[PDB]
Symmetry: D3
Subunit: 140 residues, 6 copies
């Protein structure tokens, strides 16, 4: 079932993300296997999504990461994430890892990141916080 939700997350990113280079999605799943929240990378709701705003490097001033978006969207909708799992198409960055912990998510399910030395430091900080704060990491 974890793999089926991961497959759905991949499809979500392909269908909904407007990023022209890299589409990312995350599903927050509760203990009854209900989809509590969905995030995908994008610009803020209602912000005019011009071609110029989605080019690099300009898009980084406006874009929201998928996992951050899943959490912020749950706050908007008033959906409780404490105890849930997050199934994401990309292992979280350092800042999203903090928000994952703060939202009460207890488990991250994703694929193993490709070896990239520029991300080793960030990856190490995320896993240090996850290990200490009780967040399980499961790689498909």
């Amino acid at each position: 079932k974890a793999e089926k939700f991961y497959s759905l997350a991949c499809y979500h990113a392909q269908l909904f993300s407007k990023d022209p280079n890299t589409k990312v999605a995350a599903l927050v799943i509760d203990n009854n296997n209900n989809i509590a929240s969905v995030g995908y990378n994008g610009l803020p709701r209602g912000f005019e999504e011009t071609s110029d705003r989605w080019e690099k490097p300009m898009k980084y001033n406006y874009v929201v990461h998928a996992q951050a978006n899943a959490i912020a969207t749950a706050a908007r909708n008033g959906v409780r994430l404490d105890g849930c799992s997050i199934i994401t198409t990309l292992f979280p960055c350092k800042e999203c890892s903090k928000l994952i912990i703060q939202s009460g998510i207890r488990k991250v399910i994703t694929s193993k990141p490709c070896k990239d030395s520029s991300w080793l430091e960030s990856f190490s900080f995320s896993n240090e916080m996850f290990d200490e704060c009780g967040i399980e990491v499961e790689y498909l």
Copy 2:
């Protein structure tokens, strides 16, 4: 009443924030003047808060901004932030401004930032997004 909640936010930061240099808090207030969520700057819940982890520059690897924390805490608790106002002791950074929009908060109430040219760019991006996405900014 906005000023009374801002006063309470200042007291919240002084009482609860462990940052040795700068304490920050934010109250998310609904349309019935109920406190929907509180954030303050800090390390993730349960992360060992050693002296070394709170020193600069190391603390930036672990710290969560107050306004981000208010939103992530609402997602943990399942509290609906759509339509609420956020009363904060510090005008939000560019990334927290994105999360504020995504959480459905409609209004930011704070004090006017001091002139700081290193923050002009960030301040301009936050206000560009707020203006376009319908977030009112009110300075006390």
Copy 3:
């Protein structure tokens, strides 16, 4: 966006439904485009899903329709469906149409059923109730 959610519904049915002949799913979507509930056709939760129980005609004694399941699952989870839309891979039967009305769903989005005279009566009753009770039907 309606077509993207319909595509996801089709994928949901293919991934999760255990019916060996016909897989059905339905997504209940709220006015902020959040997935409030998912249903797919299946046997009751925890009921032993033997090969014999999934054969015809025996499976009809135990199977739950996808749209009924979406509504019953929302009641289990305490998710409010009033005002939502249901995007389904199959136009609802007469009994599911009643439950759709009772759950407060205001709109059915699906594909146009193929001409089948054995279902004309049922289809006519569903649309009579939908028309009178204020449920919009939209065909992709």
Copy 4:
């Protein structure tokens, strides 16, 4: 207390059900003895309740069973039924038994059905599913 709620269910059916032959009601009660949801047999909300539509056999095209209605009404209102008990004036049919399981109700309290051979098969299927899926049946 179970008998007092059953008495109230009987009164609910007599007061609210428009069926001219048989009035049915069900109360879904949580573990704090709060009434989470009420169902009674009837036509869909807002459907014109003409004399012709309530005659037999025409009414079966439009009527909703009380226990199904209790569950669909909870989905409309966003009331969590997981772990609740359902106190009903009539033992559930095969289809309502499926929905009871799917809604997370853990216990059915009613009176013992009168001997009726035409319902033996249905009664046997309901109890087979209840026994296997963990639903307790208590007869007053």
Copy 5:
């Protein structure tokens, strides 16, 4: 329908209230005619209900009014009473009228009190607050 709910309230009081002299109940009904909360007069939950504690005048040290109980029970269960109506077997006392206003209830439905000069002052204060604060009073 208001009269049918009032009839149910009377039955609730007769079935559940342990007061040996006067049994009182109140139903808080939302705009979809769902029973949001029930109160009846009684001693606090789990307090040993001895014969001595239910005698007069001792019982007044421990008893909770039905309408107060309906509101406190909703707070325990987390049920939103804003905009609801309260259907009560007895017109509220001065203190319960305050709590009714504070809970967001917008309408009181009951029977007309019998002429009792010892209650004229209290009745006048309740209606002064109701009139000014926007609470409609409807007598059956």
Copy 6:
């Protein structure tokens, strides 16, 4: 942390209570240290707060105690108080103690009342109910 919330309660009363003699506030805090509800002593919402209505003895006809207000406000907002703690600037009166029990609050945190023989009876009844019903009292 209990003392920090008590300090905030004192500030809440000073900022928001309009009583010219004695300002009272109470914070209901959940097990994640989120502020579930706030009460302070005052007149009903929207009632014209004239100088005459706030004088003694007239104000007692209209005023609501802080702890009662915290509970009634939670019912208005639909916030679950079961299992929470109430941190109050004043030990509850006999009637508020009943409502505290009925709302599911499990713990009262306040300062020790000053010796006042006119309140001994009331204080004794509150503590008798708290002891029997499982409410812990903690004095700072």
